[PDB]
Structure formats: structure tokens, C-alpha cells
């Protein structure tokens, strides 16, 4: 809002896996729900880049578990696609919509199935 | 397309009729065998026209399913190039820090 | 009967067929013009079909590739996991 | 027998008495020549009113067809013997009978230009 | 050969068929439009034929009548010959 | 009516060709079997069209031959009515001059 | 023997020396796994330049098709291993070879968005 | 010409078979080649009506042996049609065109054939 190149720095730190940079930027007010042009958030980004504690941090700082990039993909979608099982579990724990879906209509179960990730599926079945 | 009424020079009042009544009779048979063949065709035509909404479907499904795949496939491609890059890092450190 | 009478009889039952002939002919025309509109859609089939086969082929090929990449990923993710494990043990 | 063969000529030649004499020795009132003519036919073909008469009144087939399909009525018509027409109708000859070419008596009158035989074969009975 | 080369080879021999296809299609159209003009005359046949049969029938019937009259004439000509011969002998 | 060039989403440069070259090849076969059937028909059509000038003829001959007959037949009819009249004379004198 | 079975893994795992040792006990340079991969395939599938090399130089079929129709060139392309591309061409791999879906290596590069692999598979040899 | 109701009387006498009426009318200048509306001549007419000497008379008085009624029929045609053999022979003797023809194209041989008059034909064959 009033000068989001903090948010840029944050998004960039979520990707890079820099956790102390993240911690700092939060302290500075940096927008936890900031968006790159492709519509990503930091959450999206650390899911993408397999950054577990970073996910855990951001979630703790009220990041949307169900934020949607431009194509509708959620961070769940990204962890699902990439086979980042643990990041998936915390996302779920934190209430990610298992049933949520991108603009192609793919939920995260669909993605598991389509990669044929036997384990991701069973973990996705396991909930209401 | 038939013989017009009294194409005749000489008098053939009764035959003219009887004869025309007969050509008209068997022309009704002819036209009938045409309605038979037309409807019976129109029949095998409907079985064909029904495969349309189907192939229309099959197309639409696969067009969509494809877009979905490619969007994912691009995404993996990126991840692959990324992870490929990162190895080039770690190996490139095992020659330095060997 | 009477010569008088069978002439009418015949003209009468010729009125039958001749009226019947245009009602039967009229039915033909409705069928022909319709068979025509059925043929201009039947053209669309080998077109519509071939194209759907192009799109099926397209997806499948894609899927074959995407499946190959999923694993390649799984693979690299793991190499980068090992080497890091070594490169951390190398303090 | 040729009893009908003698009768054929009786009828043709207008032999009033021979006709009778030959009906008495029971020669067939339906005898046929090579052409297929019955006594009644030639009777008509020759303007022999009285002979037609006794034929009809001896059970002669009023609608006999000669090998060409012609009837005593046709011949009658063709040759303008109105009065044999008249009595061939009185004894219910089928006006609408046709020969092998499809002609009727009416047609035959019309072909001749018979402005009369026409307006009295249109008293159709 | 060279990948470079078979792409041309194929585009080249696709130019064959595609050019050949319009020259073959063009021939079809000339045949169809002609088959059409052959069918509009073929309609005329059962018409033309039936009518010729009407006129044949007409002549023949006439001839049958005319033949009958020729003799009827010969006949009367002779009766009028006899009776005159009698009526002259009756002076 | 065939598949347009590169109906494809994904890259199929070579197949696109090979495949199109093949449909075009057998479409030339199809069109050919059509030229066969059309010419071979156009053939049995010419045998039909040749009977025309014939029936045209047959008609014209019989129309003429008929007019000729009737003109004669009328003429006889007159002669017959005439000679019929004349007998009615001679018989009608054999009752007077009997 | 399974001498080729040990070689398949040598090739996959990038075991430069095992490859050699197993060529010396003459295990077939064309060995196939359940998938239809030759040593040359996995060699490519894993960015193992040097192993591709010695395969090719031990008579390995440069245009081997796996059960899916893929070639070491396809895999190479798919995964962006430009440099194995390079040497798979130097040893005359058929660029225009297609798998069972009809793909070529070029197609596979184009699908990836490889703006480079594309401008150097268009150096078609 | 100058008052042909002589010619009418003549034509009428040729038909009626009145020979002395004919002889008289000739003496009066009556036009031997006179025409009724149907285009007949006296010759035509006596041929039609089987009037032999009348034919012979008219011929002697320069009547056209080849006069054509309106339909093209010649007196030959008429005698032919009617089976007036002797009248045919004198017509021929007097140079009637055996080959002449009405407007239907019927010569006199055709007429014999069409009545199937066996004798008229043979007599028509017998000439150049």
C-alpha cells in the first residue's frame, strides 16, 4: 500500500529461502499477503520453493492459506504439484481448502492423481 | 413429369382415363418407394448426426485437458531448470571446497 | 352400371390419385430439403472427429512429457538433498 | 358342324329366312369365322336390323369380341348404322366396351365426325 | 538425408497433392453440373416415349378403321352395281 | 472439407505434415473413385440420351402417319355415306317399281 | 546375462568406471530395461555426457527407441541437456525421429519454450 | 373468270354424273379447270364419283390430269383411294403423274398399299 517494495523484498525472500530476511521484513510491516504480477504471495512462493519453516512463519503471521495466484492456483496447488508433502500437511493443518481449484478446475487431489503421486493422494483423501 | 391429359389426336376418352388412372396409380407406388427410401435414409442420417454432440464434447474435453496439462508442464519445466541450476551450484562447490 | 356412371367413377378416383400425388409429392420435398440439411452437418463429422483426435493426441503427448518431468523433478529434488547433506557434513 | 358356317353367311347376306331355318336345326348363335365374327357381328356390319333382332332373341352374345376386340356395337358405330346401335343398346350392349386398340363405340363415332351418333351414345344407359 | 531436407521434400510433395486436389476437384464439378444437364433430358424420355406410344396407338387404330371402311366401300360400290344392273334390266 | 493446417495446440511440425500429406493422398484416391463413378455414370447416361432423337423421331413419324390416315379415313367415310345414300335410293325404287 | 542389467544402472547413476568395466566383460551396449531404455537412453536422461560418449564409441544404437518410441535424443531434448543434444547429433542421431505420439525432439524443445534448443535443432544436419 | 357460275354448274355436273349437262356446259365455255373451295376440279370430281366417260370427256377438253385439290390430292389420288381402277388407267394413259403426291407425301402407290389393294398396286408398278 503506502510503498510496497517491502512486499517485493519479502516475496523475494520467501522464494530465496532466506528466513531471517523474512523475520526482519515482517517486523517492518511488510505485507504478508503481497502479490507479484503473476499474482503470487510469499506463501505461494515458499510452497513453490519448498520452504517449510518459511511457510510456517508466514502462516503464523496471518498469511492467507487460500490465496490464489492469477491462474487460481493456491499454495496448496503448488506444493501438491511439486510433491512437497510436508508443506502440504501444514497448509492443510492451517486449513487450506482441499477442495479449492485453479481456473482449469484442478483441485489439489487432481494434481496428485495427474502426477500419480500415490502418497500425496492418500493424504488428500484422509480429510473431510 | 408424366403424360399430359389427352396427348391424343383421335378419340380415346375412356382409355385416356383408364390409362392415366393407371400411370397415376403406379406413380403413387413410385413416389411411395421414394418416401420409404428417404425416411429410411433420414434414419441412418440421425445415427450419424448424434455422434456430433459427442465429438463436439470429446474435442472440448481434450482441449481443456490439454491446456491444463501444459500449464502444469510449463510449471514443472521451470522447477526442473531451477533444480538443475542448483546442482550446478553444489557440484561447483565440491571442486572449490574439495 | 351405366356408361354414364363409370366415367364419373373413374374421373372421381382419378381425382383421388392426383390429389394424393401432390400430398405425396409435397412430403418428398420436405424430406429432400431436410436430407440436405442433414448432409451439411454430416460433412462436419470427419472434420470434427479428426480435430478431436488431434486434441486427444495433444493432451496425451503432453501428459507423457509431464509424467517424465514429475519424476525428473523428484530425482533432482533428491540429488540436491544428498549433496546438501554432504556439503553440510563438510564443515 | 358347319351349320354355324352357313349361318355366318346367312347373317352376312341378310338371309332372313336362312337364319331362321338354321336356328331351327340349332346351329350355334355364337358361331365364329376366321376373323372372330359372330352372326350378330356380320348382322351389324351389314345394316341387317331384323337379323340382329332374331339373333339377340335366340340368346346371341351382345358383347361378342372379334379377334381384334371389336363388338357388333363397334362395327355398327363405325359404319353409321344408327338404328342397329339403337337396338344393340335396347338389348343392353355395353357401351363402354373397347376393342384391342382401346377404342369405344363413342370414340368411333367421334372419329367419323358423327355429330348425331355422338349426341345419342351420350344417352348412356 | 538431412532433417532440413525432408521437411522440404514433404512440403514439396504436399504441394503436389494439394495442387492435384483442386485439379481433380475441378474435374468433379464439370462432371456434376453436366450429369445435371443429362438428368433434365433423361426426365424427357418416359414423357417423350409414352407420347410416341400414344401417337403409334393412334395411327394404328385409325388404320384398322380405314381398312374396315375400304372394304365396306368395295362392298357398297358393288351392291349399287348389282341393283342398278337389276333396275336397268327392269325396263 | 478436411482438417485445416496445424489444428494443433502443441508442436507437431513433422507429423502435422506427414499426417496431412497422408489425408491429402487418400483424399486424391477418394476424389478419383468419384471421377470413376461419375464418368462411368455419364456413360450409362449417354446410352439413355441417344434414345431421345429416336423417340423424337418415332413420335414425328406416327403423328404424320396418323394425320395422313385420318385425312383418308374422313374421305372414305364420306364415300361410304354417299354410297349408303344411293342404295336407299335403289331399294326405295324397288318398292315403287316392283 | 544380467551383465547389461548392471550396466543399465551404471549408465543411470553415472558410473563412468563401471560402464567401462562392464564393456570389458562385453555386456551388450544395447541392453534394455522393462521400459525399453538402452544404456545410451539413461546416459542421456541423466546429463551424463561422458557416458553417452563411450557408449556411442562402443557401437551403441544412437536411434534406440524405448517402448514408447522415445530416443536418447528425445529425452535429452525434454530435459534441456543441450550438450548431450550436441554430441548425439555429432554422432548422427536422426533429428526427425519421432516417438509413438509423433513428437520430434524439436517439438519437445518447442513445447518447453526452449528458445535456444530450438535455434540449434534448426541447424538440421 | 368473267362469271364462273358456269364452272360451278360444271363441277356439280361432274359429281352428279350428268354427262349431257357436261357436254352442254363445255359448249358454253364453262371452265374445264374450275375449282370448288376445297380446290377440286371437274376431273377430280368425276374421279371421286367414278364417272368414267365424264373423265374421258374432260380430258379430251384439255382438263389438267395433274390438277391438285387444296390438300395436294390429284384426281389420280382420288381414284386410287376409291379403288376406281378404270378411271385410274385412263388418267395414267393421259399422263397422270404416278409419282405425284398430296401434302402428306402420299403418292397414289402409297394409297394402294395403304388400302392393300393388290390390283391397283400392280397396275401402278407397271409404268416408268
From Swiss-Prot, chains B, F:
Localization per Swiss-Prot or TrEMBL: Cytoplasm; Nucleus
Linear polyubiquitin-binding, does not bind to 'Lys-63'-linked polyubiquitin: annotated span: 12-98
Effect of residue 77 to P: Loss of interaction with TRAF6 and TRAF6-induced polyubiquitination
Residue ranges, annotated region (Leucine-zipper): 76-97
Substitution effect: residue 78 to A: Abolishes linear polyubiquitin-binding
Variant or mutagenesis effect after changing residue 63 to A: Abolishes linear polyubiquitin-binding, impairs 'Lys-63'-linked polyubiquitin-binding and impairs NF-kappa-B activation
Effect caused by changing residue 79 to R: Slight decrease in TRAF6-induced polyubiquitination. Decrease in TRAF6-induced polyubiquitination. Important decrease in TRAF6-induced polyubiquitination
Cross-link (Glycyl lysine isopeptide (Lys-Gly) (interchain with G-Cter in SUMO)): 31, 63
Residue numbers spanned by region Ubiquitin-binding (UBAN): 12-98
Modified how: Polyubiquitinated on Lys-39 via 'Lys-63'-linked ubiquitin; the ubiquitination is mediated downstream of NOD2 and RIPK2 and probably plays a role in signaling by facilitating interactions with ubiquitin domain-containing proteins and activates the NF-kappa-B pathway. Polyubiquitinated on Lys-39 and Lys-63 through 'Lys-63'-linked ubiquitin; the ubiquitination is mediated by BCL10, MALT1 and TRAF6 and probably plays a role in signaling by facilitating interactions with ubiquitin domain-containing proteins and activates the NF-kappa-B pathway. Neddylated by TRIM40, resulting in stabilization of NFKBIA and down-regulation of NF-kappa-B activity.
Cross-link Glycyl lysine isopeptide (Lys-Gly) (interchain with G-Cter in ubiquitin) placement: 31, 37, 39, 46, 56, 63, 75, 79-80
Location of region: Self-association: 12-98
Impact when changing residue 39 to R: Slight decrease in TRAF6-induced polyubiquitination
Domain commentary: The leucine-zipper domain and the CCHC NOA-type zinc-fingers constitute the UBAN region and are essential for polyubiquitin binding and for the activation of IRF3.
Binding partners and assembly: Homodimer; disulfide-linked. Component of the I-kappa-B-kinase (IKK) core complex consisting of CHUK, IKBKB and IKBKG; probably four alpha/CHUK-beta/IKBKB dimers are associated with four gamma/IKBKG subunits. The IKK core complex seems to associate with regulatory or adapter proteins to form a IKK-signalosome holo-complex. The IKK complex associates with TERF2IP/RAP1, leading to promote IKK-mediated phosphorylation of RELA/p65. Part of a complex composed of NCOA2, NCOA3, CHUK/IKKA, IKBKB, IKBKG and CREBBP. Interacts with COPS3, CYLD, NALP2, TRPC4AP and PIDD1.
Function: Regulatory subunit of the IKK core complex which phosphorylates inhibitors of NF-kappa-B thus leading to the dissociation of the inhibitor/NF-kappa-B complex and ultimately the degradation of the inhibitor. Its binding to scaffolding polyubiquitin plays a key role in IKK activation by multiple signaling receptor pathways. Can recognize and bind both 'Lys-63'-linked and linear polyubiquitin upon cell stimulation, with a much highr affinity for linear polyubiquitin. Could be implicated in NF-kappa-B-mediated protection from cytokine toxicity. Essential for viral activation of IRF3.
Protein name (database record): NF-kappa-B essential modulator
Species, as recorded: Mus musculus
Amino acid at each position: 500500500h503506502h510503498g510496497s517494495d517491502l512486499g517485493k523484498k519479502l516475496l523475494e525472500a520467501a522464494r530465496a529461502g532466506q528466513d531471517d530476511e523474512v523475520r526482519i521484513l515482517m517486523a517492518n510491516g511488510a505485507d504478508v499477503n503481497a502479490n507479484d504480477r503473476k499474482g503470487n504471495t510469499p506463501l505461494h512462493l515458499a510452497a513453490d520453493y519448498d520452504h517449510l519453516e518459511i511457510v510456517e512463519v508466514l502462516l503464523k503471521h496471518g498469511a492467507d492459506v487460500n490465496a490464489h495466484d492469477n491462474d487460481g492456483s493456491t499454495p496448496l496447488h503448488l506444493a501438491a504439484l511439486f510433491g512437497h508433502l510436508e508443506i502440504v500437511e501444514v497448509l492443510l493443518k492451517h486449513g487450506a481448502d482441499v477442495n479449492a481449484q485453479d481456473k482449469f478446475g484442478k483441485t489439489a487431489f487432481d494434481i496428485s492423481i495427474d502426477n500419480g503421486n500415490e502418497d500425496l493422494a492418500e493424504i488428500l483423501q484422509k480429510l473431510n | 413429369g408424366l403424360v399430359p391429359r389427352g396427348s391424343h389426336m383421335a378419340s380415346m376418352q375412356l382409355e385416356d382415363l383408364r390409362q392415366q388412372l393407371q400411370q397415376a396409380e403406379e406413380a403413387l407406388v413410385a413416389k411411395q418407394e421414394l418416401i420409404d427410401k428417404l425416411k429410411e435414409e433420414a434414419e441412418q442420417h440421425k445415427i450419424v448426426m448424434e455422434t456430433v454432440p459427442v465429438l463436439k464434447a470429446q474435442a472440448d474435453i481434450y482441449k481443456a485437458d490439454f491446456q491444463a496439462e501444459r500449464h502444469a508442464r510449463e510449471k514443472l519445466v521451470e522447477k526442473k531448470e531451477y533444480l538443475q541450476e542448483q546442482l550446478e551450484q553444489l557440484q561447483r562447490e565440491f571442486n572449490k571446497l574439495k
